[PDB]
Amino acid sequence: TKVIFNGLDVNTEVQP
Amino acid sequence: QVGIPKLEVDHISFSNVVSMMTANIRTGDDMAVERVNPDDVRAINIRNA
């Protein structure tokens, strides 16, 4: 279910 | 009356000022940046833009 969250999201990782 | 650069003279000097770095400045890590897919592939425009 589409749950309401506030802050920014976490997914893929950037890299040096 | 200025400072003569010591990188060009003979006699070796000891105890110069070195530009350090505090703990704040972190280098070479990760960002938890997220993606958002184009949702539909059919209405994508590479033609011009």
Binding site: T12 | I12, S13, M21, R26, M31, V33, V36, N45
Partner: protein, 148 residues
């Protein structure tokens, strides 16, 4: 040989250091000298230390830190290259950091000048360029061989 200006028993040497060091020409220092503050965050970042190394080694260490701090490119100009590897109409929302994450710039020349020199020496080099490419199109499900 200056930090001992008043700690040695040897009498002749003591008066001589406290004369050429006391001189209106030179001066000795040690420790924290000055601080460079931050613009938006307002915290101490680049601190100068009157260290105790030599001029030959300290010169080299300053070339590195200056090239890291004068790059002017934050770790956020990383997602603009991370996006060139996906569907043309995709986008990101960067976790803004700014000056607290300085990153050295991506070399334009040294890479293209080297990837050209390596291309002639090892002519099999294209093997893992046509191979990295074929691993991408296979991962995007465009053609599946059914039987007719």
């Amino acid at each position: 040989p200056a930090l001992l200006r008043d700690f040695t028993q040897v009498n002749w040497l003591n008066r001589d250091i406290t004369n050429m060091l006391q001189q209106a020409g030179t001066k000795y220092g040690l420790g924290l000298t000055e601080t460079r503050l931050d613009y938006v965050r307002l915290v101490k970042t680049i601190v100068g230390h009157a260290l105790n190394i030599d001029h030959f080694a300290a010169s080299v260490l300053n070339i590195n830190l200056r090239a890291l701090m004068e790059a002017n490119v934050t770790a956020d100009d990383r997602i603009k290259a991370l996006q060139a590897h996906s569907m043309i109409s995709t986008q990101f929302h960067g976790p803004n950091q700014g000056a607290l994450r300085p990153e050295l710039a991506f070399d334009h020349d040294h890479i293209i000048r080297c990837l050209m020199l390596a291309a002639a020496n090892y002519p099999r080099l294209e093997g893992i360029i046509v191979q990295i490419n074929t691993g991408y199109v296979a991962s995007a499900n465009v053609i599946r061989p059914v039987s007719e």
